[PDB]
DNA sequence: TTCGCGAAGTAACCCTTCG
DNA sequence: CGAAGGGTTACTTCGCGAACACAT
């Protein structure tokens, strides 16, 4: 009866609790009743979609999915059967609905990415371009430029099109990444067995060595095609500069900004790892290799459904193989990018102050060890999780929580007698903060016993970690807190809707000029005070949720 | 039996002397408390040679007047050395125990003066200790009250 | 149609529906020396066409459910070759009843 | 109730950066409830986007706009101030 | 009519009966109610039991 | 202190392929 | 061609019932 404490949905869903909510936040219930519905039973066609959502007929489940089609929120599979018609079988897109939660910080630090050249017009112009880019799903150049009505401002916008395309933020959206990747491999695998049905004495070696490896070398090339494929740009008599093709669509490319956010996380780590002067040159030597060869974040495009027999060693070996020599520019040299004019005492900057990052990998982790620039981003991710995960559990459960959670990582299957010799707890503070932590994971105990029904207590329950559970569980808990914060925002905007329809329609400049009587005007600065705090918590919570889903 | 008879009245106090001495071995004393001249690119690509403990630090702590008879730091030379491992000391090869992490988080905050200076640059980073004084008042529906739910 | 001579192996029928319009059979020379149709306990079975299948669904107002079902790997169904959804008409003969009929859907 | 703690929340919209991201979230949420932004829903929907739905409704994707859907509701400011017919709203 | 020669007892009755409370009165009244709520059975009541 | 079949649980052994 | 993995059939253990209703 005390329904304030959000007990109404404690066993609801962690995955439905965010996606349907983010769809409801921009359109409403008739669009949230399909992405929230296609996440609850899998893939589904249009004919078997109508009779379960309890709504209108095919004239409405088709219209609201077009609004999800031109927003890139679903995935379709155009395939036919052996005796049936051509079906649809729609999916749901994870990153295509992360874009709705993610767009504001996308544009707001693409501003800081594009801060380099000048000051005033570039910020406003990028905040006009990319804000309209992400609010649509796919737009062209000639359709945008039909509402400018200028001659030099249009020239500046046409320059900034290719200035954003050269960074790696605008690529041609093709069907080959608008298709589900779990079945795009199988389409490149069933015609490949159809390619060689040769009557010849070949064993099961054909199904592991020929078809698999040739599909690898025909798939890794074809996923890298949307990186740079729309490059001719040699239209001379129109403009005297590189002009983007008008009849060519553009999307956000979704992946370089992932890389920029994770590089920002690496710099935020390096501000605490090394000193104040080493992290600056580490930033200026790290924030230039994100635009050439993108494979840094991703759990790999092919590893989702074939890592079942033995291939994980091959995935790690191929990752560390193509992980080097592809960004292989000048590893430690000079560049005309930025030198941060400061003491960054050293009043001389060539080949003597730019060698301080050579002493940044031999200490505690930045991990560019072997020769010159080799392996900079492979052996951080199993510890970049473990560095941020300890700083959350220690800041929440207390300073003695990281003292117990890190000891068991050193020696798994640890007893309480030998953890007393390793820790310093008095008599019972070993087990008190253990029982305060056992309701959370990374405590997970294993039992020994060889008895009948626990007769003489057998000296049981020595503690392990099982660190692959607790990272996923922390990700679930953070994602639930994310979506619960957004539902606090939704209940706030749902509570007082009778004073919102007038406060934004005709009340712009005269809001302080006595248009509302002084009895409820403080509610207008109350519905804007802690609704600002919701988005501030969202901003400072994206910087902690997106570290537990690395490769 | 060198640790079972000391429960617990000066083990947490004994941490401070050895941590301050390793911080003195790895950093300057007075130049750590402030940011004026941050230790010269720290120690000019610092000090491959300088280790922490070999055969002298045990007798140094023994003769440091810790209000005890000079008996039984016998096996606390390495057990207390590995016992301080969480965010404080360094392991990499042998006796390379370094301090650098928490000398900014709690040294310049607890034993320091307060100022509302140029602190409008900390952007969503790893700040455990900071931002005390939970609510004033009543915890308006989006504060720290909800973490107990498992999910 | 394949006719075994002895005990089968588990790896023979591992891909039987692998051909999309066709299949293979599975027999045994031991239990095929006499056919079950001429036996006195089995009445006359005959398969109906697709046009005659929708006639009893109009006469009894039924559908592709709620019928007395017969299964695959049944000796009558393996003798006759009932694939799926094929109505077989049984012309069974009780003693004091006459020459009445019954219909069975194959599943 | 039950009092756990979160490290991050308090004393953090006083700076301009988190306020900038928050006000831009407000602006994105305010604009996103308008559908197509006065130039759209016409170009790229036939171009390999759900052929079974871009073929059955070739003139019927123009249902969402801000040129006519925000146009029809703005004609009624003048038909009511001069003429009155008794019809339910 | 089901397809196989089956029995009348507590495993021979569960071949056709989607009715749960009919099965939860014949034998094993405990196990038939715990299994029906696990599998989310609809149980449109039409039988005379 | 008792017969009835149906669930898991565990072992002997034969087919199939690898280098 | 010898050895390793996947999978069919065969030996052994538990539990659920044992009819209706009256007076104790």
PDB file of N, CA, C and O in Angstrom, chain A residues 351-400:
ATOM      1  N   UNK A 351      61.765  16.139 -28.935  1.00  0.00           N
ATOM      2  CA  UNK A 351      62.550  14.919 -28.726  1.00  0.00           C
ATOM      3  C   UNK A 351      63.098  14.736 -27.305  1.00  0.00           C
ATOM      4  O   UNK A 351      63.889  13.814 -27.072  1.00  0.00           O
ATOM      5  N   UNK A 352      62.716  15.579 -26.352  1.00  0.00           N
ATOM      6  CA  UNK A 352      63.162  15.478 -24.966  1.00  0.00           C
ATOM      7  C   UNK A 352      62.010  15.547 -23.977  1.00  0.00           C
ATOM      8  O   UNK A 352      62.037  14.849 -22.960  1.00  0.00           O
ATOM      9  N   UNK A 353      61.002  16.374 -24.248  1.00  0.00           N
ATOM     10  CA  UNK A 353      59.783  16.393 -23.455  1.00  0.00           C
ATOM     11  C   UNK A 353      58.704  15.495 -24.042  1.00  0.00           C
ATOM     12  O   UNK A 353      57.824  15.039 -23.304  1.00  0.00           O
ATOM     13  N   UNK A 354      58.774  15.209 -25.341  1.00  0.00           N
ATOM     14  CA  UNK A 354      57.881  14.264 -25.999  1.00  0.00           C
ATOM     15  C   UNK A 354      58.354  12.819 -25.877  1.00  0.00           C
ATOM     16  O   UNK A 354      57.914  11.973 -26.660  1.00  0.00           O
ATOM     17  N   UNK A 355      59.252  12.527 -24.936  1.00  0.00           N
ATOM     18  CA  UNK A 355      59.666  11.167 -24.626  1.00  0.00           C
ATOM     19  C   UNK A 355      59.183  10.723 -23.252  1.00  0.00           C
ATOM     20  O   UNK A 355      59.599   9.666 -22.769  1.00  0.00           O
ATOM     21  N   UNK A 356      58.315  11.510 -22.611  1.00  0.00           N
ATOM     22  CA  UNK A 356      57.821  11.153 -21.285  1.00  0.00           C
ATOM     23  C   UNK A 356      56.756  10.060 -21.363  1.00  0.00           C
ATOM     24  O   UNK A 356      56.554   9.326 -20.388  1.00  0.00           O
ATOM     25  N   UNK A 357      56.108   9.886 -22.518  1.00  0.00           N
ATOM     26  CA  UNK A 357      55.168   8.785 -22.678  1.00  0.00           C
ATOM     27  C   UNK A 357      55.862   7.454 -22.926  1.00  0.00           C
ATOM     28  O   UNK A 357      55.195   6.414 -22.906  1.00  0.00           O
ATOM     29  N   UNK A 358      57.176   7.458 -23.167  1.00  0.00           N
ATOM     30  CA  UNK A 358      57.923   6.208 -23.172  1.00  0.00           C
ATOM     31  C   UNK A 358      58.048   5.639 -21.766  1.00  0.00           C
ATOM     32  O   UNK A 358      58.171   4.421 -21.597  1.00  0.00           O
ATOM     33  N   UNK A 359      58.017   6.505 -20.749  1.00  0.00           N
ATOM     34  CA  UNK A 359      57.964   6.091 -19.353  1.00  0.00           C
ATOM     35  C   UNK A 359      56.537   6.010 -18.826  1.00  0.00           C
ATOM     36  O   UNK A 359      56.313   6.170 -17.618  1.00  0.00           O
ATOM     37  N   UNK A 360      55.562   5.782 -19.705  1.00  0.00           N
ATOM     38  CA  UNK A 360      54.167   5.648 -19.315  1.00  0.00           C
ATOM     39  C   UNK A 360      53.657   4.220 -19.421  1.00  0.00           C
ATOM     40  O   UNK A 360      52.553   3.937 -18.940  1.00  0.00           O
ATOM     41  N   UNK A 361      54.420   3.315 -20.024  1.00  0.00           N
ATOM     42  CA  UNK A 361      53.995   1.936 -20.208  1.00  0.00           C
ATOM     43  C   UNK A 361      54.722   0.952 -19.306  1.00  0.00           C
ATOM     44  O   UNK A 361      54.131  -0.058 -18.918  1.00  0.00           O
ATOM     45  N   UNK A 362      55.983   1.215 -18.971  1.00  0.00           N
ATOM     46  CA  UNK A 362      56.728   0.464 -17.963  1.00  0.00           C
ATOM     47  C   UNK A 362      56.130   0.547 -16.551  1.00  0.00           C
ATOM     48  O   UNK A 362      56.172  -0.462 -15.837  1.00  0.00           O
ATOM     49  N   UNK A 363      55.549   1.704 -16.073  1.00  0.00           N
ATOM     50  CA  UNK A 363      54.768   1.628 -14.824  1.00  0.00           C
ATOM     51  C   UNK A 363      53.414   0.947 -14.978  1.00  0.00           C
ATOM     52  O   UNK A 363      53.154   0.270 -15.980  1.00  0.00           O
ATOM     53  N   UNK A 364      52.583   1.081 -13.935  1.00  0.00           N
ATOM     54  CA  UNK A 364      51.256   0.472 -13.875  1.00  0.00           C
ATOM     55  C   UNK A 364      50.397   0.912 -15.059  1.00  0.00           C
ATOM     56  O   UNK A 364      50.565   2.011 -15.598  1.00  0.00           O
ATOM     57  N   UNK A 365      49.439   0.046 -15.408  1.00  0.00           N
ATOM     58  CA  UNK A 365      48.988  -0.230 -16.774  1.00  0.00           C
ATOM     59  C   UNK A 365      48.638   0.991 -17.620  1.00  0.00           C
ATOM     60  O   UNK A 365      47.880   1.873 -17.203  1.00  0.00           O
ATOM     61  N   UNK A 366      49.274   1.055 -18.788  1.00  0.00           N
ATOM     62  CA  UNK A 366      48.785   1.765 -19.962  1.00  0.00           C
ATOM     63  C   UNK A 366      48.931   0.807 -21.135  1.00  0.00           C
ATOM     64  O   UNK A 366      48.196   0.902 -22.124  1.00  0.00           O
ATOM     65  N   UNK A 367      49.887  -0.120 -20.998  1.00  0.00           N
ATOM     66  CA  UNK A 367      50.045  -1.326 -21.817  1.00  0.00           C
ATOM     67  C   UNK A 367      50.244  -0.983 -23.299  1.00  0.00           C
ATOM     68  O   UNK A 367      49.364  -1.148 -24.142  1.00  0.00           O
ATOM     69  N   UNK A 368      51.411  -0.402 -23.575  1.00  0.00           N
ATOM     70  CA  UNK A 368      51.997  -0.428 -24.916  1.00  0.00           C
ATOM     71  C   UNK A 368      53.435  -0.899 -24.702  1.00  0.00           C
ATOM     72  O   UNK A 368      54.376  -0.102 -24.663  1.00  0.00           O
ATOM     73  N   UNK A 369      53.594  -2.209 -24.533  1.00  0.00           N
ATOM     74  CA  UNK A 369      54.875  -2.769 -24.117  1.00  0.00           C
ATOM     75  C   UNK A 369      55.919  -3.024 -25.212  1.00  0.00           C
ATOM     76  O   UNK A 369      56.979  -2.383 -25.175  1.00  0.00           O
ATOM     77  N   UNK A 370      55.670  -3.946 -26.219  1.00  0.00           N
ATOM     78  CA  UNK A 370      56.790  -4.734 -26.774  1.00  0.00           C
ATOM     79  C   UNK A 370      57.886  -3.993 -27.533  1.00  0.00           C
ATOM     80  O   UNK A 370      59.007  -3.879 -27.026  1.00  0.00           O
ATOM     81  N   UNK A 371      57.595  -3.482 -28.729  1.00  0.00           N
ATOM     82  CA  UNK A 371      58.650  -2.795 -29.448  1.00  0.00           C
ATOM     83  C   UNK A 371      58.608  -1.283 -29.496  1.00  0.00           C
ATOM     84  O   UNK A 371      59.481  -0.611 -28.937  1.00  0.00           O
ATOM     85  N   UNK A 372      57.590  -0.737 -30.164  1.00  0.00           N
ATOM     86  CA  UNK A 372      57.449   0.706 -30.353  1.00  0.00           C
ATOM     87  C   UNK A 372      56.031   1.184 -30.038  1.00  0.00           C
ATOM     88  O   UNK A 372      55.840   2.090 -29.220  1.00  0.00           O
ATOM     89  N   UNK A 373      55.025   0.585 -30.695  1.00  0.00           N
ATOM     90  CA  UNK A 373      53.629   0.955 -30.491  1.00  0.00           C
ATOM     91  C   UNK A 373      52.721  -0.266 -30.423  1.00  0.00           C
ATOM     92  O   UNK A 373      51.494  -0.109 -30.492  1.00  0.00           O
ATOM     93  N   UNK A 374      53.281  -1.464 -30.285  1.00  0.00           N
ATOM     94  CA  UNK A 374      52.517  -2.697 -30.421  1.00  0.00           C
ATOM     95  C   UNK A 374      51.599  -2.908 -29.222  1.00  0.00           C
ATOM     96  O   UNK A 374      51.901  -2.490 -28.101  1.00  0.00           O
ATOM     97  N   UNK A 375      50.491  -3.604 -29.483  1.00  0.00           N
ATOM     98  CA  UNK A 375      49.363  -3.938 -28.596  1.00  0.00           C
ATOM     99  C   UNK A 375      48.966  -2.809 -27.628  1.00  0.00           C
ATOM    100  O   UNK A 375      49.243  -2.875 -26.421  1.00  0.00           O
ATOM    101  N   UNK A 376      48.337  -1.723 -28.103  1.00  0.00           N
ATOM    102  CA  UNK A 376      47.869  -0.692 -27.168  1.00  0.00           C
ATOM    103  C   UNK A 376      46.449  -0.846 -26.643  1.00  0.00           C
ATOM    104  O   UNK A 376      46.097  -0.112 -25.712  1.00  0.00           O
ATOM    105  N   UNK A 377      45.608  -1.733 -27.199  1.00  0.00           N
ATOM    106  CA  UNK A 377      44.214  -1.759 -26.758  1.00  0.00           C
ATOM    107  C   UNK A 377      43.643  -3.171 -26.624  1.00  0.00           C
ATOM    108  O   UNK A 377      42.422  -3.350 -26.681  1.00  0.00           O
ATOM    109  N   UNK A 378      44.480  -4.182 -26.409  1.00  0.00           N
ATOM    110  CA  UNK A 378      43.969  -5.539 -26.247  1.00  0.00           C
ATOM    111  C   UNK A 378      43.968  -6.012 -24.801  1.00  0.00           C
ATOM    112  O   UNK A 378      42.966  -6.559 -24.335  1.00  0.00           O
ATOM    113  N   UNK A 379      45.066  -5.819 -24.069  1.00  0.00           N
ATOM    114  CA  UNK A 379      45.150  -6.267 -22.685  1.00  0.00           C
ATOM    115  C   UNK A 379      44.823  -5.158 -21.691  1.00  0.00           C
ATOM    116  O   UNK A 379      45.370  -5.133 -20.583  1.00  0.00           O
ATOM    117  N   UNK A 380      43.944  -4.233 -22.074  1.00  0.00           N
ATOM    118  CA  UNK A 380      43.338  -3.294 -21.138  1.00  0.00           C
ATOM    119  C   UNK A 380      41.927  -3.703 -20.743  1.00  0.00           C
ATOM    120  O   UNK A 380      41.564  -3.581 -19.571  1.00  0.00           O
ATOM    121  N   UNK A 381      41.144  -4.191 -21.709  1.00  0.00           N
ATOM    122  CA  UNK A 381      39.726  -4.482 -21.487  1.00  0.00           C
ATOM    123  C   UNK A 381      39.406  -5.514 -20.401  1.00  0.00           C
ATOM    124  O   UNK A 381      38.395  -5.314 -19.705  1.00  0.00           O
ATOM    125  N   UNK A 382      40.160  -6.608 -20.186  1.00  0.00           N
ATOM    126  CA  UNK A 382      39.882  -7.422 -18.988  1.00  0.00           C
ATOM    127  C   UNK A 382      40.286  -6.761 -17.678  1.00  0.00           C
ATOM    128  O   UNK A 382      39.904  -7.267 -16.614  1.00  0.00           O
ATOM    129  N   UNK A 383      41.037  -5.662 -17.708  1.00  0.00           N
ATOM    130  CA  UNK A 383      41.394  -4.948 -16.491  1.00  0.00           C
ATOM    131  C   UNK A 383      40.737  -3.564 -16.423  1.00  0.00           C
ATOM    132  O   UNK A 383      40.492  -3.068 -15.311  1.00  0.00           O
ATOM    133  N   UNK A 384      40.404  -2.948 -17.567  1.00  0.00           N
ATOM    134  CA  UNK A 384      39.611  -1.718 -17.556  1.00  0.00           C
ATOM    135  C   UNK A 384      38.217  -1.957 -16.986  1.00  0.00           C
ATOM    136  O   UNK A 384      37.641  -1.059 -16.361  1.00  0.00           O
ATOM    137  N   UNK A 385      37.664  -3.157 -17.182  1.00  0.00           N
ATOM    138  CA  UNK A 385      36.510  -3.567 -16.391  1.00  0.00           C
ATOM    139  C   UNK A 385      36.876  -3.638 -14.915  1.00  0.00           C
ATOM    140  O   UNK A 385      36.245  -2.988 -14.077  1.00  0.00           O
ATOM    141  N   UNK A 386      37.934  -4.385 -14.591  1.00  0.00           N
ATOM    142  CA  UNK A 386      38.333  -4.662 -13.215  1.00  0.00           C
ATOM    143  C   UNK A 386      38.858  -3.441 -12.470  1.00  0.00           C
ATOM    144  O   UNK A 386      38.933  -3.480 -11.237  1.00  0.00           O
ATOM    145  N   UNK A 387      39.233  -2.373 -13.171  1.00  0.00           N
ATOM    146  CA  UNK A 387      39.627  -1.141 -12.500  1.00  0.00           C
ATOM    147  C   UNK A 387      38.422  -0.283 -12.139  1.00  0.00           C
ATOM    148  O   UNK A 387      38.404   0.342 -11.075  1.00  0.00           O
ATOM    149  N   UNK A 388      37.408  -0.253 -13.004  1.00  0.00           N
ATOM    150  CA  UNK A 388      36.219   0.550 -12.741  1.00  0.00           C
ATOM    151  C   UNK A 388      35.259  -0.197 -11.816  1.00  0.00           C
ATOM    152  O   UNK A 388      34.600   0.413 -10.966  1.00  0.00           O
ATOM    153  N   UNK A 389      35.199  -1.529 -11.944  1.00  0.00           N
ATOM    154  CA  UNK A 389      34.322  -2.351 -11.109  1.00  0.00           C
ATOM    155  C   UNK A 389      34.705  -2.305  -9.635  1.00  0.00           C
ATOM    156  O   UNK A 389      33.824  -2.310  -8.768  1.00  0.00           O
ATOM    157  N   UNK A 390      36.001  -2.268  -9.328  1.00  0.00           N
ATOM    158  CA  UNK A 390      36.425  -2.135  -7.941  1.00  0.00           C
ATOM    159  C   UNK A 390      36.154  -0.748  -7.379  1.00  0.00           C
ATOM    160  O   UNK A 390      35.833  -0.627  -6.192  1.00  0.00           O
ATOM    161  N   UNK A 391      36.243   0.294  -8.209  1.00  0.00           N
ATOM    162  CA  UNK A 391      36.010   1.655  -7.745  1.00  0.00           C
ATOM    163  C   UNK A 391      34.535   1.965  -7.535  1.00  0.00           C
ATOM    164  O   UNK A 391      34.214   3.004  -6.952  1.00  0.00           O
ATOM    165  N   UNK A 392      33.636   1.108  -8.008  1.00  0.00           N
ATOM    166  CA  UNK A 392      32.216   1.222  -7.709  1.00  0.00           C
ATOM    167  C   UNK A 392      31.849   0.449  -6.447  1.00  0.00           C
ATOM    168  O   UNK A 392      31.168   0.980  -5.569  1.00  0.00           O
ATOM    169  N   UNK A 393      32.328  -0.793  -6.331  1.00  0.00           N
ATOM    170  CA  UNK A 393      31.990  -1.618  -5.176  1.00  0.00           C
ATOM    171  C   UNK A 393      32.688  -1.104  -3.915  1.00  0.00           C
ATOM    172  O   UNK A 393      32.150  -1.230  -2.808  1.00  0.00           O
ATOM    173  N   UNK A 394      33.843  -0.446  -4.063  1.00  0.00           N
ATOM    174  CA  UNK A 394      34.521   0.136  -2.911  1.00  0.00           C
ATOM    175  C   UNK A 394      33.883   1.454  -2.498  1.00  0.00           C
ATOM    176  O   UNK A 394      33.801   1.763  -1.305  1.00  0.00           O
ATOM    177  N   UNK A 395      33.430   2.244  -3.466  1.00  0.00           N
ATOM    178  CA  UNK A 395      32.763   3.496  -3.151  1.00  0.00           C
ATOM    179  C   UNK A 395      31.334   3.299  -2.670  1.00  0.00           C
ATOM    180  O   UNK A 395      30.770   4.215  -2.062  1.00  0.00           O
ATOM    181  N   UNK A 396      30.736   2.135  -2.923  1.00  0.00           N
ATOM    182  CA  UNK A 396      29.388   1.852  -2.442  1.00  0.00           C
ATOM    183  C   UNK A 396      29.391   1.054  -1.142  1.00  0.00           C
ATOM    184  O   UNK A 396      28.847   1.510  -0.132  1.00  0.00           O
ATOM    185  N   UNK A 397      30.003  -0.132  -1.142  1.00  0.00           N
ATOM    186  CA  UNK A 397      29.932  -1.008   0.022  1.00  0.00           C
ATOM    187  C   UNK A 397      30.955  -0.671   1.098  1.00  0.00           C
ATOM    188  O   UNK A 397      30.900  -1.259   2.182  1.00  0.00           O
ATOM    189  N   UNK A 398      31.880   0.248   0.835  1.00  0.00           N
ATOM    190  CA  UNK A 398      32.845   0.647   1.830  1.00  0.00           C
ATOM    191  C   UNK A 398      34.271   0.357   1.413  1.00  0.00           C
ATOM    192  O   UNK A 398      34.523  -0.408   0.476  1.00  0.00           O
ATOM    193  N   UNK A 399      35.238   0.979   2.098  1.00  0.00           N
ATOM    194  CA  UNK A 399      36.652   0.753   1.753  1.00  0.00           C
ATOM    195  C   UNK A 399      37.140  -0.656   2.042  1.00  0.00           C
ATOM    196  O   UNK A 399      38.126  -1.086   1.432  1.00  0.00           O
ATOM    197  N   UNK A 400      36.484  -1.388   2.941  1.00  0.00           N
ATOM    198  CA  UNK A 400      36.850  -2.769   3.230  1.00  0.00           C
ATOM    199  C   UNK A 400      36.234  -3.763   2.254  1.00  0.00           C
ATOM    200  O   UNK A 400      36.437  -4.971   2.418  1.00  0.00           O
TER     201      UNK A 400
END
